[PDB]
Paper text:
During infection the influenza A virus NS1 protein participates in multiple protein-RNA and protein-protein interactions to perform a plethora of functions. The N-terminal 73 amino-acid residues of NS1 form a symmetrical homodimeric RNA-binding domain (RBD), which is connected to the central effector domain (ED; residues 86-204) via an inter-domain linker. Our bioinformatic analyses indicate that the N-terminal RBD forms a very stable homodimer, while the predominant and ubiquitous helix-helix contacts between C-terminal EDs bear many similarities with weak transient interfaces.
Although the helix-helix dimer interface is shared by all structures of the NS1 ED, and may have some biological role in that RNA-binding activity of NS1 is affected by its disruption, we noted that in all helix-helix structures the arrangement of the two ED monomers differs markedly relative to one another. However, at this same concentration we routinely observe complete dimerization of the PR8 and Alb/76 NS1 EDs. A key aspect of our functional model is the instability and flexibility of the NS1 ED helix-helix dimer, which seems weak and transient in vitro, but may be slightly more stable in the context of the full-length protein, or become more permanent in the presence of certain binding partners.
Numbering used by the authors:
A (entry chain A): 85 to 206
B (entry chain B): 82 to 202
The structure:
Amino acid sequence: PASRYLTDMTLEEMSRDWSMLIPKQKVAGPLCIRMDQAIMDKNIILKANFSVIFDRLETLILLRAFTEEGAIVGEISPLPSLPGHTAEDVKNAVGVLIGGLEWNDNTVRVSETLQRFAWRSS
Amino acid sequence: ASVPASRYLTDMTLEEMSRDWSMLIPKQKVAGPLCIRMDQAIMDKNIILKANFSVIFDRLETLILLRAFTEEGAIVGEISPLPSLPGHTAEDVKNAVGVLIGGLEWNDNTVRVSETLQRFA
């Protein structure tokens, strides 16, 4: 099947409202990165929702960052203009958020489903 | 013939080492034996990391002070051993520097490492 939607998150998790106590935000190419500076010493799970064409990444719809208690503390997503992006853009945006969260000695686990596609080649 | 097994590498001047600097908006971390700091206000600049450090044979042994400088000569960042001085490794420094670079890059600063730090890191 040549188009699949890979959904780390639930519906409720995709659309939930969240807020940063101490906002940090950055534009990496065609992607916006967000993280709450207030958060420290937490293990953090990256959950991604994205699409895939044949066996390669198509689009990242949304990635959110979760504490082990289910609280959202960060997010990556496409710029409101919704432009095209590469796996490399993504690899890069994920790296930059890992660095950001790691400042307050949080541990970050990437989405294994996304990384399986984003760290691919030809 | 050859150069000592111990050398002292000085990318900075005495005035450069002892100068105080202000972080407009502080961003500090401790990585074990190392303090990392930088000014969060700083944006879109070109920045060079410079270092005063010891070498044994061909590898950084002990860091004395690393600073981050704007093209104008303003210090915008710093990696310094904590003052009880409980020992760090060449590797502990490579790592700290990655953390300063990434933190600085957040605000679209462009960062270079000195050629010295490049040889002996």
